[PDB]
């Protein structure tokens, strides 16, 4: 019960402050809500109909999302380009000297 506006011990956070993101944390049998500064790793923020919520980051070989079609940080050993990750770095530009960015 941290970051909520209305709260229950069984359900955790019910409603969030406008500034925080709603997120259902699972724990085997338990499921309780949380309001967070940002969405947890592997999730990106979504200003939903009633709630700011967290959607799962589903991009090809990406590990961290800003948005649905844009990647922050790729699967280690992949090269990022315009929010997309590649093993075979494309013909647009070559990888930079050390850092993995085409």
């Amino acid at each position: 019960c941290k970051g909520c506006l209305s709260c229950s011990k069984d359900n955790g956070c019910l409603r969030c402050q406008p500034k925080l993101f709603f997120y259902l944390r699972r724990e085997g049998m338990r499921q309780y809500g949380e309001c967070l500064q940002s969405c947890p790793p592997g999730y990106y923020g979504v200003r939903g109909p009633d709630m700011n919520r967290c959607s799962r980051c589903r991009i090809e070989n990406c590990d961290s999302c800003f948005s649905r079609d844009f990647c922050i940080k790729c699967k280690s050993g992949f090269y990022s380009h315009k929010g997309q990750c590649f093993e075979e770095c494309p013909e647009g530009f070559a990888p930079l000297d050390d850092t993995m960015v085409c």
Binding site: S6, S8, D10, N11, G12, L14, F22, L24, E27, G28, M29, R30, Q31, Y32, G33, D50, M51
Partner: protein, 125 residues
């Protein structure tokens, strides 16, 4: 129309009430808690347990979505909203049964989930 509820790990015995919105029958499965906002828009064979606070969907449609997500039966802990019972009397013909509970029975059920020791649950009519 009342119902019996029993719980054991891999013990507890409670009572409750079926809802006229759904179809009354027995059922068995694992015990999985669900947040009210979860049922909006896990492996199957489980009896869901949802504690309702004092809206995304109607309770019937929340029970509908619970079954459609692969739930053997819907347990509504209505301790914090007794009016929920009145608004589940209208018949909708839901498949999986919708049982209601509250009080120290509901308190007991939720502590088993709180303990985080995996357990199985069954319902008889």
């Amino acid at each position: 129309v009342k119902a019996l509820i029993r719980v054991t790990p891999l013990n507890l015995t409670l009572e409750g009430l079926f809802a006229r919105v759904a179809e009354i029958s027995p059922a068995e499965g694992r015990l999985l808690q669900f947040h009210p906002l979860s049922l909006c828009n896990t492996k199957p064979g489980f009896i869901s347990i949802v504690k309702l606070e004092t809206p995304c969907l109607s309770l019937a449609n929340k029970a509908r979505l619970a079954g459609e997500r692969g739930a053997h039966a819907v347990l509504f802990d209505i301790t914090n909203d007794r009016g929920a019972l009145q608004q589940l009397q209208q018949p909708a013909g839901i498949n999986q049964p919708v049982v209601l509970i509250w009080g120290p029975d509901a308190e007991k059920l939720m502590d088993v989930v709180n303990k985080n020791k995996e357990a199985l649950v069954k319902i008889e009519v």
